[PDB]
Amino acid sequence: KIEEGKLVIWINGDKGYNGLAEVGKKFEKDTGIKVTVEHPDKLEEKFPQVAATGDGPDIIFWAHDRFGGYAQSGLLAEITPDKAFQDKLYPFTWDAVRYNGKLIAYPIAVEALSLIYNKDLLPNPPKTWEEIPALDKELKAKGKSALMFNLQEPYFTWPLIAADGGYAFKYENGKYDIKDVGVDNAGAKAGLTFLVDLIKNKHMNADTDYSIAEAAFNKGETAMTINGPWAWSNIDTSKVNYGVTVLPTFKGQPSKPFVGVLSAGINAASPNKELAKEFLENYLLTDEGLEAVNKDKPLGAVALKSYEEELAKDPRIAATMENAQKGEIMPNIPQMSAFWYAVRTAVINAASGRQTVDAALAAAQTNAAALKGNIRVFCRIRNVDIIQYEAPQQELVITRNINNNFSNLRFLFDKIFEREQSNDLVFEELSQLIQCSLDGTNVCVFAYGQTGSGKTFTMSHPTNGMIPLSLKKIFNDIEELKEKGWSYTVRGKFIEIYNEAIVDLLNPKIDPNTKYEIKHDDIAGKTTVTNVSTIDIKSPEQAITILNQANKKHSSRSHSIFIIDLQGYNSLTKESSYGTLNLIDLAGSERRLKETQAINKSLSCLGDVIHSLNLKDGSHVPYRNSKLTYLLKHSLGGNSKTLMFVNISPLTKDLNETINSLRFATKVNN
Numbered sequence: 001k002i003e004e005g006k007l008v009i010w011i012n013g014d015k016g017y018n019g020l021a022e023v024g025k026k027f028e029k030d031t032g033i034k035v036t037v038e039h040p041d042k043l044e045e046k047f048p049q050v051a052a053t054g055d056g057p058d059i060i061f062w063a064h065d066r067f068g069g070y071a072q073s074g075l076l077a078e079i080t081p082d083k084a085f086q087d088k089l090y091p092f093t094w095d096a097v098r099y100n101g102k103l104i105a106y107p108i109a110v111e112a113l114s115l116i117y118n119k120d121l122l123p124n125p126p127k128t129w130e131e132i133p134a135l136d137k138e139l140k141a142k143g144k145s146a147l148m149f150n151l152q153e154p155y156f157t158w159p160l161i162a163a164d165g166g167y168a169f170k171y172e173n174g175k176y177d178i179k180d181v182g183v184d185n186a187g188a189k190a191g192l193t194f195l196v197d198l199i200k201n202k203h204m205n206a207d208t209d210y211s212i213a214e215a216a217f218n219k220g221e222t223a224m225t226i227n228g229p230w231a232w233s234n235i236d237t238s239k240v241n242y243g244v245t246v247l248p249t250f251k252g253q254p255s256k257p258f259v260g261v262l263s264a265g266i267n268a269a270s271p272n273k274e275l276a277k278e279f280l281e282n283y284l285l286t287d288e289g290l291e292a293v294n295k296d297k298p299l300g301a302v303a304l305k306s307y308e309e310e311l312a313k314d315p316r317i318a319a320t321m322e323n324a325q326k327g328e329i330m331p332n333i334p335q336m337s338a339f340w341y342a343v344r345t346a347v348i349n350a351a352s353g354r355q356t357v358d359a360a361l362a363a364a365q366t367n368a369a370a371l372k373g374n375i376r377v378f379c380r381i382r383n384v385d386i387i388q389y390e391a392p393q394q395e396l397v398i399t400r401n402i403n404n405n406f407s408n409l410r411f412l413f414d415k416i417f418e419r420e421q422s423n424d425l426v427f428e429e430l431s432q433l434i435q436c437s438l439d440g441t442n443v444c445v446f447a448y449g450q451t452g453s454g455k456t457f458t459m460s461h462p463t464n465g466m467i468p469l470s471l472k473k474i475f476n477d478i479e480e481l482k483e484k485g486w487s488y489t490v491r492g493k494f495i496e497i498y499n500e501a502i503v504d505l506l507n508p509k510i511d512p513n514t515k516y517e518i519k520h521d522d523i524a525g526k527t528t529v530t531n532v533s534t535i536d537i538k539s540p541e542q543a544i545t546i547l548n549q550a551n552k553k554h555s556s557r558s559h560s561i562f563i564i565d566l567q568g569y570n571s572l573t574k575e576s577s578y579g580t581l582n583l584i585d586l587a588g589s590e591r592r593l594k595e596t597q598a599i600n601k602s603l604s605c606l607g608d609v610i611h612s613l614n615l616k617d618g619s620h621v622p623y624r625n626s627k628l629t630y631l632l633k634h635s636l637g638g639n640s641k642t643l644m645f646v647n648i649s650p651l652t653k654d655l656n657e658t659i660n661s662l663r664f665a666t667k668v669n670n
C-alpha cells in the first residue's frame, strides 16, 4: 500500500524533477511531510499497472493526454480547487484536464514542439520542409547535417504527418469521433512519405532517437533539431548559440504539433489526498514553485497566469505558443493511447523500410479506429435436440429451459454463422486480410472450440477450408501484383504444439536431443523456430498435398499451426515487404490429465494475451506464458490482425461446453 503521512511523486525523466524535489523540500520544511520525487521508466505504463492494485505514487505527472484513460479506469481522484484558485490558471488549461465534466488533474504548463536551430551554422533557418534536402547537401559539404530529431516517438513525427491533413480523431461538436480516424488519409500518407524520403535520401537516419539527436545538436554537429521546452537548459550549458522558431511548412501548410499540458493527478488510492492538494496548490502552483522546476528544465507556457505573464516575453516561449496555436490540443480520451501505439508502430515500420508508407498507415488506421478493429471474433454454429438460439443484430441469445425456468445467456460477436452457411461465405471475412499479409502486416486465424465443434472443417476442408482458400487467394493476388512490379516468394511451415513441445510436422528431425527453440528478432519483428523445415510453395495444390500427407500420422489434443511467409520485392520502386499469415487449428477446449492441464493453461494464456492486446492501453502482454503465444508474438502484437472463429455444437447435450466456449469468446472480443 501507499504510506500515509508521506508524498511519493512520479514524473518523467525529461522534466525538471530536481527542481520539483526542491519544492518538496520546502513542503517538508514547513509541514514535516516528507516528499519523495521519482522518475521511473515507462511510468505512464506502470502507473495504471500498480494503481490498479492500490499502490503507486500519491501524485503522477504526465501530459494531459493520458489522464482520460486513468480516469475511465477509476485510477484518479477528482481534484477540488475552489474558484479563487481556478481563477489563477488559464481556462484553456483547465479544459485540458477535464474528463466527463470533472477536473481530474492540476494543469502545470503548455508544451509544444518547435524548430530549434544553430544560429552560427544557420542564421536563416528554412521556412519549408521542402528546402531541407538541399540544405542538407550544403551542410554535408562542411561535415555537418541539416536536421536530427527523435524518430522513435510519433510525438515528434506527427506535426509533419498532420500538416497536409492527417489527424487522430475528427472533432465535430462536443465529441471526438472515435469512428473517424485520419491516420491513413492522403494528408498523412503525404507527410509520412516525405519523412521516409528524407531517410531514403540519407538526410536522416531511421535509427535516430532522443539521445542521439540531442548530443548531435548540442555538440554543434547538426544545424537543426525538433524538441520541446524541457530541452532548452541542456542547450544553454552547451556552446551552441540557438534560436527557437516556427516549424517548417509542408506543401505550404504549417506543421501541426500535438499540444500537451503537463498535468498532475492524484492517485485514487492515496490516503494522502488532502496533503497532495496542499502541496500542488500551495507549493508547486506558485511563482516560486514553478520557477524552481522551470530553472531545472523549462516548462513552457505555465498554466499559472502570474508566472506566465512574467515569462511571456521570452522569444522561445512565444515560438512555443505560435507552434501551439498552429497545432491542436491533444484529446484526453482513453482511445488516444490506441492512437499513439498504432502510429508509433507505423512510423517505425515505414522509416526502417520494412513496410511501405501506405501499408503501414492502413494497418495503424484500423488499429486506431473503433471500426472492424484489429481483433475480430466470429461464432460458427456447426450444421446439424437442438439448442434454442436467436441471432439478432451481432448478438447470440441462448435460451435454456432449466426445470422449470427460462434462462437467456447473451453473447456479442462481430458475426454469427449458422446453418449451411458455407466455408466460402465465412472466408469473405478473411479474404481482405490476405492483402494485409502481402503488404507485410501479420495475421493470425484461430479456430477454437470443443472437439467435434468443427474447427478442422472450418480451417482444413480440402476444397474450401480457410487454409486452401487462403492459399488460393494468395496466388491469385500475387499474379495481379506482378502488373505493379511485385514479385513474391511463398514459404510454409507446418508445426504442432503438444503438451508444450514443438514437432515439425513436415520434416520430423531424427536426433533425439534436437531442439526446437523459438527465436525472435525483436528488431525486424521476425521469428524462426530452430530446426523446423520450410517448403517453398509453388502452388496451392502443392501445399495442400504436402499438408494432407504430413497429417497422415492426437490431433484433437494439440495445436496445429500452418505458417505462410510472404516475401515481396518490387523492381520498380525497389521496395520490400515481409508478411506472415498464421492459420491455427487449436486443441479441443473441452473439460490425459497432463493433456488437460496443458491445454487449459495454453488456451487460457491465449485469451489473456488477446484480451490485453485489445485494451490497446499498454497493459502487460504475457507472450512467454505459452509456446503458442510466444511462437506467434510478432503476428499478434503491433498492428497485426487477428481473426478468431469460435466453433460450437448446436446440440443440447453439448450446452455446457458451448457456454464455456462462448464465455471465452466475449473475453477475447472485449
Ligand SMILES: OC[C@H]1O[C@H](O[C@H]2[C@H](O)[C@@H](O)[C@@H](O[C@H]3[C@H](O)[C@@H](O)[C@@H](O[C@H]4[C@H](O)[C@@H](O)[C@@H](O)O[C@@H]4CO)O[C@@H]3CO)O[C@@H]2CO)[C@H](O)[C@@H](O)[C@@H]1O
Pocket (backbone or CB within 6 Å): 012, 014, 042, 044, 045, 063, 064, 065, 066, 111, 152, 153, 154, 155, 156, 228, 260, 337, 340, 341, 344, 618
Ligand atoms: O511499447 C512501446 C512504447 O510504449 C510506451 O510509450 C507510449 C506511451 O505509453 C503512450 O502514452 C504514448 O506516449 C505519448 C504521450 O502520451 C504524449 O503525452 C507525448 O509524449 C511526449 C510528452 O508529452 C512530452 O512531455 C515529452 O516528454 O516527450 C514525449 C514524447 O516522447 O507523445 C507520446 C508519443 O510519442 O505513446 C507511447 C508510444 O509511442 C513506453 O513509454 C515506451 O517505452 C515504449 O517503447
Ligand SMILES: Nc1ncnc2c1ncn2[C@@H]1O[C@H](COP(=O)(O)OP(=O)(O)O)[C@@H](O)[C@H]1O
Pocket (backbone or CB within 6 Å): 381, 382, 383, 384, 449, 450, 451, 452, 453, 454, 455, 456, 457, 458, 556, 647
Ligand atoms: N459446418 C458444418 N457443416 C456440416 N458438417 C460439419 C460442419 N462442421 C463440422 N462438420 C462435420 O463434423 C465432423 C466433426 O467436425 P471437425 O471439424 O472434426 O470438428 P473439430 O475439428 O472441432 O473436432 C466432421 O466430420 C465434419 O465433416
Ligand SMILES: [Mg+2]
Pocket (backbone or CB within 6 Å): 455, 456, 457, 556
Ligand atoms: Mg479437428
